[PDB]
From a paper:
Structural comparison shows that the α-KG binding does not cause significant conformational changes in the overall structure (RMSD of <1.0 Å for all Cα atoms) but induces small conformational changes at the active site. Compared to the apo NcT7HΔC structure, in the α-KG-bound NcT7H structure, the residues composing the active site and the associated β-strands move slightly towards α-KG, and the active site assumes a relatively more compact conformation. In the ligand-bound NcT7H structures, α-KG binds to a positively charged pocket with the C5-carboxylate embedded in the pocket and the C1-carboxylate oriented towards the substrate. The C5-carboxylate is stabilized by four hydrogen-bonding interactions with the side chains of Tyr194, Arg286 and Ser288. In the α-KG-bound NcT7H structure, the C3 atom of α-KG is about 3.6 Å away from the hydroxyl group of Tyr194.
Like the TET proteins, [name] is also a Fe2+ and α-KG dependent dioxygenase.
Numbering used by the authors: 1 to 109, 114 to 333
Amino acid sequence: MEKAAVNEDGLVIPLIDFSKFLEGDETLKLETAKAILHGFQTAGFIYLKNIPIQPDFREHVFNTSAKFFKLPKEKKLEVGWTTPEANRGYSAPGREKVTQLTDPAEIEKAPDIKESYEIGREDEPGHPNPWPAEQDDLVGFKSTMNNFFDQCKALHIEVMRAIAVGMGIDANYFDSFVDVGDNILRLLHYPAVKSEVFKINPGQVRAGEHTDYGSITLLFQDSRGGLQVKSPNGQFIDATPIENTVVVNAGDLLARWSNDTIKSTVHRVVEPPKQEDVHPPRYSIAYFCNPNHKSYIEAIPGTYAAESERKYEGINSGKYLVQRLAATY
Ligand SMILES: O=C(O)CCC(=O)C(=O)O
Ligand code: NI
């Protein structure tokens, strides 16, 4: 095993070689799957290295993302969300506008310093992706992003197999729960920002603390830093960027699905841990994996020894997620 990616305040996030799961004999594969699962059961986060997604293609996806966010605001808004529940296209958090009708109670006004672009699967009636015009630097944007979507789709399936192998159940247990690919590819851009912004403003952050809603999130980050994970002792710990890794974390739905054997951990993005006048732009890409909308989510076999140990009632996956997202708007 590699040295842990993070080891502080009781938070241990392992660094795991995923090729040893995909290519190993039964025994090396099992060992790797146990390490993966152990990570999810303790930190709720792992780093994976040597995944089947190529570094040059990943670099290209990041360059493609930055070309999109370099578009004028008015062009990015052209691919904004078509409705509030679309969950597809361009978004930027906005603070409420003060007007002569804003009363003293409403004056408690900071939003995430970020913008995003969300892409779902291309074969979903009622939920098409709003693609930008393929011209100048955005030629190939669609094929690049759809490609990356499908590679992340495959990686999700394989992470779930590692979880199944680690649990000692059928390797393919999750396949029929996730095969629709009801996943969201989220491109993120955190603009350049003066460090003084954070000196003046108290709890200004790049992304507010939260847990993810779904099963698994695959997080690709650049070298800027700023991602933090809450330790079991209540303190935020830097998830330092490691070249050519993917950070993988469990979401609330998997915590539940696992009967709380797996952790969904609070995390956030703050100022990078680098002292500088101006913090340059930070790019990341989160691929939110979910069970099929129609899936009924109840305790995974092996996560409870008896009926009484089942902590949660069953729920429909689609329903749960729209509930969590409706509240977000
Ligand atoms: O940008 C990051 O590193 C984390 C983003 C994140 O946690 C999210 O969008 O859910
Ligand atoms: Ni998150």
